[PDB]
Symmetry: C3
Amino acid sequence: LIAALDARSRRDALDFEVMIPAQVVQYDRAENIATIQPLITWVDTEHNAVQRHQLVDIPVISMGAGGFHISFPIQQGDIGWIYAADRDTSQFLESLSMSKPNTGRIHKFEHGLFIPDVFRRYTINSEDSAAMVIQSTSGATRISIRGDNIKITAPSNVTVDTPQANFTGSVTIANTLVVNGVNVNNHGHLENNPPDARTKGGMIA
Amino acid sequence: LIAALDARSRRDALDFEVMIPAQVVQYDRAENIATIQPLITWVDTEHNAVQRHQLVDIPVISMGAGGFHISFPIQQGDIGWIYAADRDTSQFLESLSMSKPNTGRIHKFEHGLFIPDVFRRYTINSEDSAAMVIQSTSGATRISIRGDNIKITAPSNVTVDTPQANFTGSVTIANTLVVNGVNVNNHGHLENNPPDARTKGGMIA
Amino acid sequence: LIAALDARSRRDALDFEVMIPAQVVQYDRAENIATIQPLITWVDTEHNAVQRHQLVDIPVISMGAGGFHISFPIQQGDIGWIYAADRDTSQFLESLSMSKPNTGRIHKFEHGLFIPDVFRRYTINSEDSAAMVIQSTSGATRISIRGDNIKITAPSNVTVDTPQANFTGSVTIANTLVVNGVNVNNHGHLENNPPDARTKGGMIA
Ligand SMILES: [Ca+2]
Ligand SMILES: [Fe+3]
């Protein structure tokens, strides 16, 4: 009989984990690890599809290198993809350096990586149809990068916290400019004649 | 004979899909799914290397969590990597929640994830050699993050669309400042003496 | 005996590479490829755990599409995850187009993709606990995106290099504003009477 190896091959492929959609149960942003719940059940011999185990202490990617990175404020319930490492990563995670596997389990989500993905749960404004956006998923607060311009939109404010902000060209401000507490639109100056009289009105062309 | 299992092992490994470079045939940015064409052929028994099938309805990652994400304006022809999920993801994609596989196909690109990658098709300006950049691939329009400063460059304009933009330090503008339609470089004020005469010239030190 | 296939299955799973943590040995940012050193040893038949081979010419992801991307200034020693492609990618990498495998090696890191990950080696400021940040890993220089506002922080400066910067609302500047070399806080104007006398002091309400 040859059905034997067919059965084996199937079992072995089912047991070998690679990638599946998954959800955050809990997340620690300082240690950048999560408890993760896979979101596709597996059919058992009994033909019952059942919920998979949680995975603990799973690193969540923070893309970055060279002293820079991108970090999202991950919440319980957020979704993404868990990947299974070839070997136990637990010692590597302790040291972030060259390590041995502490165990013999291979190709299992238990030692994996979670990559957050919002899937389709976002809105792109029509003006950004040809742009890259880094944004709230609502689309309300965004940095939009286009081929020759950048547009930064926020319903409340944009705050630039730095000692020196430099503009190498011109600047146009639609409404009010206040500098050190003084409204420039409406400002004046003391005259020499009449002595110490403030000029009339505000700033004019 | 023992060559039997050697043949099996090889077949099974060839059939088990994980990751391959691939190209976007069509993309829907609202549903965040693509038709994808793998870019490496597979050699058949006949020793013919032939083009692989398109995959439809493949989610394209939008990295994000916590109400924020990053989205690129993916175009036909863009490249990247397709990953094969362990099990059918179609029901999960309908609901974005806990689900069963609708079918028995495992480790196939048919149910996968596409991650866009520009590979080497970009230019980094020399001034950004030690910086992170989020930019047009031409390098012309960029946000460059350095250890202690941020430089935002755009050939046309940078527009900040918000009711209130706050600078916590000083600001230097090279050229013209216009506020509510009035050129500040060149502005003046009405005098009390001579009555209602505009001051001479523009703004001076 | 049936232990035979158990041994085979195990061997085949060990030989089949998918994903493991790894480190950059060398990186070329123009060609966007690296020499990579996996960071988990593998136990051999002799029960010796030993360091894995370097992989050369490994593409490092640059997430992007549609003419935009994100690039980090990767350094020797930076860490992340290497993924194994199903087939030889070398011809595909030459052309970035549809290709055959040059060889028969399958599911090996030798032809792979590296994704940089900083793991937990970063600091999130408490004010950003619910925000997305793109930042130096020190947390000192950052773009922080919140539900209705964006805060850009840099200890040295933020420079906006563009011919035209537009603010669609109001702007408040805490300290000094200089426009074309003239300090606005302290500016004045020539009077008509007294003829050509500069106004007293600086700008006042
Ligand atoms: Ca006067
Ligand atoms: Fe004035």
